[PDB]
Amino acid sequence: IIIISCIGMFWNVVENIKLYFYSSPSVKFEYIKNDSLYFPAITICPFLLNWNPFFTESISFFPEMNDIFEIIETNEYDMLYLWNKTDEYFQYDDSYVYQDALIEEDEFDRSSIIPNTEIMSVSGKCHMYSLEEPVYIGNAIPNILIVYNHSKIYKDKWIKVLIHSIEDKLTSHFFAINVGVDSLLQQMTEVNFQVIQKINLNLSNNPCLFPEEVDKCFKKCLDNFMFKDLSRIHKCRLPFMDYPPDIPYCNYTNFPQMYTRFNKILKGFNKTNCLCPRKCRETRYEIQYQFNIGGFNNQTFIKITSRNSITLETEYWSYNFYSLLSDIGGSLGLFLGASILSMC
Amino acid sequence: IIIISCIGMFWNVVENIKLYFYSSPSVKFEYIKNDSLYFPAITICPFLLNWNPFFTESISFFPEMNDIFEIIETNEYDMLYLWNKTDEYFQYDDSYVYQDALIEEDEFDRSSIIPNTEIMSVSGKCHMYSLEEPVYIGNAIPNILIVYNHSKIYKDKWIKVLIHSIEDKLTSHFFAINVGVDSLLQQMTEVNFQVIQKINLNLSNNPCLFPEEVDKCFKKCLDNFMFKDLSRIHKCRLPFMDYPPDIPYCNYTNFPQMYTRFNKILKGFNKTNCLCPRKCRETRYEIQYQFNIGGFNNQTFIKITSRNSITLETEYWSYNFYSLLSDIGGSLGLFLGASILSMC
Amino acid sequence: IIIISCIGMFWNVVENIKLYFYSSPSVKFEYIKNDSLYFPAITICPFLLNWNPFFTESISFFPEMNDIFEIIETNEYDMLYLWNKTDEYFQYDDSYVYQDALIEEDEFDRSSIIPNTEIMSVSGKCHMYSLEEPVYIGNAIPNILIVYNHSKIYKDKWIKVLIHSIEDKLTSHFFAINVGVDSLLQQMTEVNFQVIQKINLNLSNNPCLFPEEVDKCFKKCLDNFMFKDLSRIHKCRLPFMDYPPDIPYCNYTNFPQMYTRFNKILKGFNKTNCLCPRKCRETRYEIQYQFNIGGFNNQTFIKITSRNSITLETEYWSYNFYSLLSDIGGSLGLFLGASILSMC
């Protein structure tokens, strides 16, 4: 009985030390109403290069991608001139954060944003709008309004509004075509998003990093993963990649093949292969819903809002050291009635 | 060893008693499918007093707020007559709870609601629709349909549909302008909401109260906080405040200044300053999404629904007294092998 | 003191054994981003039999249900011919899973779905679209596009898009009228859904079963519950029930009464009465939101997507046996300083 109880004592002490150290961190889920919220960055990108009004409008038919490649081969474009000419069809006119009050704000309360306007992305030149300090959410979530002007009354012309975190401004626009929201030109749209905060625990085996460093790691991995295949193909870089700095930009002769490859490459690109550390404090913004207000307009109004609360996922340890010791003592006091003093 | 083990025993017993008493209550998160759900109250409010068709229609230009103030100064309106005249442009015709069945319900199954119609809010006179007993959600969530009639074929005229809890019917319409959903006149709209229940634990330091008392506390605090600034300005009360009962209603001369102040006052009003107790059983209704059905109509149809499940956040204590005693006993049996009997 | 401490020891040991065995399983809530997701089945069903263009179009007025019953009595329809003729007004033309890439997919990358097209449901003949293996969600959620062709330019004609799990393909279409989403004919629609996975624990008292068996149990219970009332009424089966296999299908004389009864029967049908076991691994798909793209079209495009992450609810036991033993030992070591050895 002393021998069986001692094999038991030792085993119940193993199980405890297991559940303390070798156990996954538990997760606390909350639906919080934060009085101040960090608004997302909004990247406005041009739609597929087969639909850019710089190509579509001139020619007669509705271009396809191969027709666009032939056009780029005929008129011999610098691929950087071609990237510059794409953004011309929204022509940002005004963007401001404003509140929905009982006396409509008029150019004095609304805070004016200045987009980046020089982002290079898979579809052309994109504009990023962002805020530097959080807005007050106590009464309601303020509205961002991006206004775009056009020259002609465009029909069936689209852009992409991608809502992301400013801490992911280096590797977010590339997926705007698939993760973005289609916005019709000359038509007011409302994109109500939802915020998902996740506080991860820094672990020795899996140490989380600041969002800046995780974004840099993802950007570097994306650049190497693009350049490997694009050097396999023709050994040049497209206008939307900055990594091989010496390696020259592609020309019109090589751009079609590279773009056709890169589309397929990006279709299956998976972030799991890019082994980068997690984020200790990560904020994501999902699209809660999209609404269309009114009919045709002479300006494209893009309204970004949230009608929802923040979803908080905090990682915490349910087992403390002071409970591990108590459980080991309980095992000792059940199986053998032992103690520190006793053993000693 | 006896002295170091005793300083240890005592410290492991402190940590335990800490984690039991001096610890935050843990939260259980569920996505429940309640067979019966309390439908929210729906407050239909007029849009900004610069857009009310009682002002906009008569004059030539599109009024601004200062033009409205000048008009209120010219035609000398009783501010209570002016609040009465605002609601005239939706003219409730019918509202009923109906189910989406395979044989459409026709005036015999649908339950008829009678709105309040006499709410006073920052924008004018508002109508509250509510249900007295829960509907059955077993098969699907029934639909509330509010029908509004108008005189002229109004163009670019809007109202505000605010979805709230009946237990918050005293301090909810005031924020309808910012927390509401814009509904276009003479156009069917669908406002699908989501329900967030949160069961808080009554704590000695932070004792929760019934939703009625929390709503009364918030109403009282809002009334005092409005009246302080509005007595600073001109020492009168607007048509949408009931608190200083003797204090006379404002007239046309003083209404412009008071309203202009009150807009700014409400822009930054924060409920944290209003220290009121939490709610033991609080139910919130967020807007899941908004859809537009059809084009122009001779009646404004507002459809309120839910296509989602309820989000339950229950506060509970993960540590019980019978586990505190066990952990203290384990600490005693590890560090010193002590016990009640022993010590005694 | 020995007697009071022993009544205490025994009681603290009861409380522990209670909280271990006789306690509800705890729930872990996560917002996961699964690299591969099982897309839902999409059931396209005709709208109410009073609005089917097979009836509405021929006659002059807008039929009501009683007018449809009179028509079914006049022209003497086989109720199976009548169920066949209803589906003719969407005429599936193409359905495929495609990704939103920077070079639009054209009939080579998109995977072609073949709907079931022979489902019998309360409203007529329905088409189920489904996928056999999960799609990759690493970069974005691919889009399902269902294309429908029509003969005439239909006005105010609707269908129902119900998003459900393939493991619930036997008892899901029946509620499509109430749980479905109204889609307007000849008009592109986007139905963005959200996924709710729930991993239940198999319990002796409440043993969960595979989704196939739970779906079969629900189908059987629905069939018996329909047939009981429908044999009370006229002792025949409607075209959308397969259970009493010998019992003949209803004819035009009896169909009106049976359908009128069955509508009311289905209005209050509750699954709680149908005592079937839970699902160990259940996946639900709720409608996140619905968007309308463009205006009139010659084809009905139904786009099914998700812009969101999966909501995971995993049931797990917070108390392990190796912690129960430790707590019992701690209770023994606190109240009496006992142990296995001691007692023995």
DSSP A266-291: HHS--TTTS----BSEEEEEEEEEEE
* Structure-block tokens of residue C45: 């069903």
Nearest-neighbour CA in chain A from B103: distance (Å): 30
Name the experiment that determined this structure: cryo-EM
* DSSP per-residue codes, B226-291: HHHHHHHHTS-B-TT--SSSSSPBP-TTTHHHHHHHHHHHHHS--TTTS----BSEEEEEEEEEEE
Resolution expressed in Å: 3.0
Long-range contacts of B259-265 (CB under 8 A, 24+ apart): B259/A102, B259/A103, B259/B49, B259/B69, B260/A103, B260/B65, B260/B69, B261/B229, B261/B230, B261/B233, B262/A102, B262/B122, B262/B226, B262/B229, B262/B230, B262/B238, B263/A101, B263/A102, B263/A103, B265/B225, B265/B226, B265/B229
* Partner C contacted by B311 (CB < 8 A): no
Q: Closest CB to A341: pick one of B263, B272, B336.
A: B336
Contacts of C221 (CB under 8 A, 6+ apart): C274, C276
Residues in chain C with CB shorter than 8 Å from the CB of B105 are none
In this complex, do C178 and B99 lie within 8 Å of one another by their Cβ atoms?
yes
Compute the distance between CA of residue C102 and CA of residue A337 in angstroms, rounded to an integer.
Answer: 71
Whether B91 contacts B150, CB under 8 Å? yes
Type of residue at A188: M
Residues in chain B with CB shorter than 8 Å from the CB of C336 are 339-341
Q: Burial-class residue C206 by CB neighbours within 10 Å (0-12, 13-18, 19+).
A: exposed
Chain B neighbours (≥3 Cβ pairs under 8 A) are A, C
In this complex, do B12 and A307 lie within 8 Å of one another by their Cβ atoms?
no
* DSSP per-residue codes, B43-103: EEEE--TTS-HHHHTTSSS---HHHHHHHHHHTT--HHHHHHHHGGGT-EEEEEEE---SS
> Rounded to the nearest 5°, which phi and psi values hold at B61?
-75, 180
Nearest-neighbour CA in chain B from A200: distance (Å): 18
Contacts of A105 (CB under 8 A, 6+ apart): A98, A99
* Partner C contacted by A174 (CB < 8 A): no
Nearest-neighbour CA in chain C from A135: distance (Å): 24
* Structure-block tokens of residue B16: 């335990």
* Structure-block tokens of residue A102: 């009982």
Contacts of B55 (CB under 8 A, 6+ apart): B49, B63, B68, B71
Residues in chain B with CB shorter than 8 Å from the CB of A100 are 177-178
State the DSSP code for C87: G
Q: Closest CB to C335: pick one of B288, B308, B339.
A: B339
Whether A236 contacts A61, CB under 8 Å? no
Q: Percent helix, strand and coil across chain A, each rounded to 5?
A: 30, 25, 40
Scanning B15-74 for CB atoms below 8 A from A yields 15-16, 19, 26-27, 29, 48-50, 65
For residue A149, what is the enclosing H or E element?
strand A143-149
Q: Closest CB to A138: pick one of B29, B271, B335.
A: B271
Compute the distance between CA of residue A120 and CA of residue A133 in angstroms, rounded to an integer.
Answer: 25
Q: Distance between the two ends of chain B, CA-based, in angstroms?
A: 22
Compute the distance between CA of residue A205 and CA of residue A93 in angstroms, rounded to an integer.
Answer: 49
**B310 to chain C: nearest residue by CA?**
C286
Chain A neighbours (≥3 Cβ pairs under 8 A) are B, C
Mutate one of A109, A326, A335, A336 to test the B interface: name it (highest B CB count within 10 A): A326
Compute the distance between CA of residue A146 and CA of residue B322 in angstroms, rounded to an integer.
Answer: 59
| Residue A126 CA from chain centroid, whole number | 15
In this complex, do A328 and B330 lie within 8 Å of one another by their Cβ atoms?
yes
* Partner B contacted by C336 (CB < 8 A): yes
Whether A167 contacts A212, CB under 8 Å? yes
Nearest-neighbour CA in chain A from B107: distance (Å): 31
For residue C14, what is the enclosing H or E element?
helix C2-21
Compute the distance between CA of residue B131 and CA of residue B42 in angstroms, rounded to an integer.
Answer: 10
- Angle among Cα C78, C82, C88 to the nearest 5 degrees reads 145
Compute the distance between CA of residue B45 and CA of residue B124 in angstroms, rounded to an integer.
Answer: 7
Could you tell me the residue ranges of all domains in chain B? Answer: 2-23+319-343, 29-316
Compute the distance between CA of residue A38 and CA of residue A135 in angstroms, rounded to an integer.
Answer: 7
Three-state SS at A329: helix
Residues in chain C with CB shorter than 8 Å from the CB of B192 are 289
* Partner C contacted by A4 (CB < 8 A): no
Compute the distance between CA of residue A332 and CA of residue B205 in angstroms, rounded to an integer.
Answer: 38
Please report which residue ranges of A149-303 form alpha helices under DSSP H: 176-179, 211-233, 255-267
